[PDB]
Amino acid sequence: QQKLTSPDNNLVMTFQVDSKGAPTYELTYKNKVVIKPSTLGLELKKELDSKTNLYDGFEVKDTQTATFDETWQPVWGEEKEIRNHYNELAVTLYQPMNDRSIVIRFRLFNDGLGFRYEFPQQKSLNYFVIKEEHSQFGMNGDHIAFWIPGDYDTQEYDYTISRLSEIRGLMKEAITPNSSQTPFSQTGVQTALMMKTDDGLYINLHEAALVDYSCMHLNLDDKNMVFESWLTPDAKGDKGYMQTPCNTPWRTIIVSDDARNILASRITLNLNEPCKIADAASWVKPVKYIGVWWDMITGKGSWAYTDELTSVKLGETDYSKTKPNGKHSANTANVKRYIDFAAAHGFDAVLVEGWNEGWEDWFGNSKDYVFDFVTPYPDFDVKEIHRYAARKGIKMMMHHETSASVRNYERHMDKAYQFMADNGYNSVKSGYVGNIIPRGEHHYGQWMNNHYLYAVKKAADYKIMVNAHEATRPTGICRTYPNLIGNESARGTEYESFGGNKVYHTTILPFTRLVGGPMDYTPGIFETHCNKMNPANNSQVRSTIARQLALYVTMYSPLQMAADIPENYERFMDAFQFIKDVALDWDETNYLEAEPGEYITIARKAKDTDDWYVGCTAGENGHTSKLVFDFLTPGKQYIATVYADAKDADWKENPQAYTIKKGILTNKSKLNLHAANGGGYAISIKEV
Amino acid sequence: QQKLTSPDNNLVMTFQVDSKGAPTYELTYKNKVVIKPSTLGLELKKEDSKTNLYDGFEVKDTQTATFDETWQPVWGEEKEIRNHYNELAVTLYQPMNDRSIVIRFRLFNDGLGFRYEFPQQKSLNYFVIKEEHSQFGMNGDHIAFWIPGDYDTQEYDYTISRLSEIRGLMKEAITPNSSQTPFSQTGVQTALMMKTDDGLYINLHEAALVDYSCMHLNLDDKNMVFESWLTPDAKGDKGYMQTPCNTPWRTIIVSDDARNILASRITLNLNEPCKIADAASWVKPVKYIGVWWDMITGKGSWAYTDELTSVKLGETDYSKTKPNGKHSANTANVKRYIDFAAAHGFDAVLVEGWNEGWEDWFGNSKDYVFDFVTPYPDFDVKEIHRYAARKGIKMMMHHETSASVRNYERHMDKAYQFMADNGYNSVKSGYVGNIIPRGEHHYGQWMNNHYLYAVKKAADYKIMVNAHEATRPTGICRTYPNLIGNESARGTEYESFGGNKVYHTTILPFTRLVGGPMDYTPGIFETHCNKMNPANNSQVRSTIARQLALYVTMYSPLQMAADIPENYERFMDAFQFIKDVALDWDETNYLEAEPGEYITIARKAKDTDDWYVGCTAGENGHTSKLVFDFLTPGKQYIATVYADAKDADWKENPQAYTIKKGILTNKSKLNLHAANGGGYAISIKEV
Ligand SMILES: [Ca+2]
Ligand SMILES: [Ca+2]
């Protein structure tokens, strides 16, 4: 038996090898059980039977302990500086029957535990294939969980809030239709998984540094309340090709008696390798943008240039011989009106989708040669858009939807990134909509994880920033490659056009999806009835206008869209001011209020300023805030503008009802505010 | 009932739909049935009635044409090829699915090709093939020359048996390989060669295997019907299609004379004309030697060091490892090969083992296995370049991928630029091991796309490609003549792995060579492998004279002299034939041919009045009465005859040969005997 304690002494992890030589761990917090005794280990694919066993028959050959305490600065983040402070136990475990050794490394922080497996180079462990990882997390009770279905292919599901014992009965309805989805179990859920216990704890289960390895989901044993690592299989059912020396990703248990401290934890980032982009600070930069986007997402407009053809063949179809469909939003004149608005209002960039040949066939065809990423449609003048944008101090953000055709994207990748450089594009939104090609792979297997990271490492060579939709959900790698400024990789604002997101969605994402990296959520919908874009579309955004403003503060990202069309912003320009003002990068963050599923309220100090921005987002019952502004600087005065729900505001019946109040605040000020149902508020607080 | 006839009237193809609308064809030759009534169609993957693309058809329209044009390959067995056929195109409408296909038939004096065409139309755009059902009904229990149907290797010895005997011989026919997936107890590969009891020779194959999965044949041995059996992808599906598109052609080449099978150019004729406009300025035949046989026999290693349990590229520091003392691809050794190549008029030298990574090359399913650009510490890329260039020798690049295909694609532009920067203009690639991405097979639609992509990209860099382990050829060299070889069959390397059957080279030209040349790597003079490495007791099943013969009887613009220089130096008199023999031809005359038994071929060297002759023979040897009436009237020629000595024998007496020099004219006749596993070679040079 071996004990490890957090620096503050509040957490204790006990490790032991049992009688069958299986490694076991457990974890307590303030003397409460968080993880019950839980085994660790892996089973390997057969090439001898005993070699398949990397889960028991071990003995402790060595232990080492260490303490780390160093502060580092992210290129962009929720605060200027992050402290990485932990006590470590490393245990060398030897398996006589196989004459081989592994190491399990534990790092225990004041806010939780990380563990991983290490496989040293040695005579009898070199090349191996993982059949299953058997990392357990035994729960001490039938907790409340906030979860989406375990799935190898999508995370674009609404959350469910339920007991662990209720997950099974709810899985069928929780799995809604998607273009690519492979659920794996009636009790399978994804990470990060957020839980609230009856004895007042908050527990988050996740992984960190998902590199050269398959994505971990969790399979719940709902009779014993034990979660277990369930990795994503390849086209043959295997779960990772390994070569020593190599490590698994970290597995993390983040725990506190204060839900706010889950949001504050930096465990995920802390467990990633330090920045490998030496010049990152010189070129990696936050981006606020608008886009030719919502037209197509609502169905008002098309990505396609033409409706005349039953299919297209790149290099054969002559688009100049085709009839424009009259709906193609990515045309030069329209694009320039977006640049105009962007530049009028202080935005950095304009995204355009549907600019390149191919879009007629983008959806659900399993098409290999679906795009070339370089050839514009006849009505999109690349160089003139570039000149016009540059004139206005605006950057165009590139769009590389791959339609999940991965070999095809790789073959064009250097040409595509060269085209970006040649044409003044320095960020790209990529996409992987559809089932993966090569066919047989899943979006989150080891094979695709390699692709996503290859795309980002190659981008870094071109000084290009990457925002990858449909990719594996983040696990802190942005620390290592700060040019990964976004993913979607969860259910975003676009689904508010596809029937809606749950009213409580944005009170969950920061506790789950956001752990490991920002999301390109694309907030800022002011006209929430999609039927005003497209009369055939009766979807309604589940939000008030004020809650949309809040999201620029409650959905942290160095990449922030204002997603509505300019004409809609023009109708509510007074509210639009908050989107214009809000910063993208922060020196400090204060988590003021937080309860998963119910409300989140955050105040952040804009980097290199003494201005603060506050947002509150609420669920189905609203939320009353008693805000206390003692985080402001003593003796200073600030001009505060409060953008709040009207008293009769409601996400469904009255979403555009907002108030704007401008006044002075100091560190002695207090405000009482009420977020409507599916409502919220935003405050800018600028030092006089 | 539609009827199509060959230009010379000897072949007749009849077509009709049966009473359930199934497309049905049959083929006769000189009034003998070659193909019994046989059906054509496909079954499609379900997105019920739409899965049927095999019956319910009605003939909507027919069109006929005749084509007769001559064209010139960049390299080949003759200067000019005549493309002469009658064509029938049948539009088939399927009312139940409101869609049409076209089946196009081309009928030559030596056989039939057909393909399916899928026009763009409202009700047929994207579709996935579940199975293709092209039938070839045989008229008897023919003798066949076959290798096991397999998605992953063709490196098998041939078996000669009745169709009815295939099932019982399959188990023994499937020998161990590092990547192999047999599919049927009666599954064989193409090109399949057959000899009938009523005196015909029949070859079943495909042409222009592009954007489609490789076709094998599955024998129904009750009815004697072969049927197309495509190669599945990782999910079991057999081709992603998008209209307008076509299947490759399916070919039945038939004659009452076996020599006419070798003479046929149906396969090339059904491929699209050359797409490399400047091919003739840069695509050139290559005679080569190489640092190669050392490693194949186990005398030397590809690896630089033995002291590591595995390597990681960009982490492993080879300059800090101990050389194993056996790494043949070192500068000094390479320069000696270059010396011998230049001395003897060779074009190039291959070197394998030159690049980081070889320690882990075999069977690890390793992704990042090679980078194709970083030399080991004892291989000085620049020094070897400048030396070879000064000696008038080109280095041939080696890209073994170890079947890690995404890894190769990621490195490919860089690898090709490295070649261009370092004076390499030809590359031998390899795909040894199971394919990565894992789940795909070597011959599926996915990989066929890969091999051709590597070729088309190479052509943009003016690079010639010789791809081992790739899908066996189907005449695409006509379209991209920088594809100057494949192995894609069992080559000489396996003579080091236990031996090839004595009759192997009397079968390949009837099977593997139909569709394109083979990098067979002939020319082993020291046929006992234990002289290279004492632990290898493999013996090449050949005489020295038969090895010489292979420079004529195994056609290829790419020809290796595969033995080590010191072995050639022991037999420099026999070596002279290898030095003299040409690589490219204005004419070819097939003098004698019987599959499994003997092949004798005379060819006229391009732009000369010189001829070269080879005979290769099986287990029983062969006696030729050669008649030289193909030489020019009134001319005199210096002939050098390299023949098996009396009582030469592949097994007991392989190195016994004679050399006789004399004058020949078109009135000359010679009687020659090829030993068991023997043969002979003749150079015939105009005075
Ligand atoms: Ca999406
Ligand atoms: Ca081979």
Author numbering:
A (entry chain A): 22 to 68, 86 to 726
B (entry chain B): 22 to 68, 87 to 726
Can you quote the paper on this entry?
The structure of BtGH97a was solved using X-ray crystallography data to 1.90 Å resolution. Phasing was performed using single-wavelength anomalous dispersion data collected at the peak wavelength (0.9795 Å) for selenium, and the majority of the protein was built automatically. A calcium ion is present in the (β/α)8 barrel domain; it is octahedrally coordinated by four glutamate residues (Glu194, Glu508, Glu526, and Glu532) and both oxygen atoms of a molecule of ethylene glycol, which was sequestered from the cryoprotectant. The calcium ions in each molecule of the asymmetric unit in the native structure (and the complexes described below) yield atomic B factors of 14–16 Å2 when refined with unitary occupancy. Superposition with other (β/α)8 barrel GHs (data not shown), as well as the presence of the four glutamates, suggests that the calcium ion is, in fact, bound in the active-site region of the enzyme. The calcium ion displays high apparent affinity and may only partially be removed using EDTA or Chelex. Partial removal of the calcium causes a substantial reduction in activity, but the enzyme maintains a residual activity, confirming high metal ion affinity. The addition of calcium to the EDTA-treated enzyme resulted in restoration of full activity; all further kinetics experiments were thus conducted in the presence of 10 mM CaCl2, at which the enzyme had full activity.
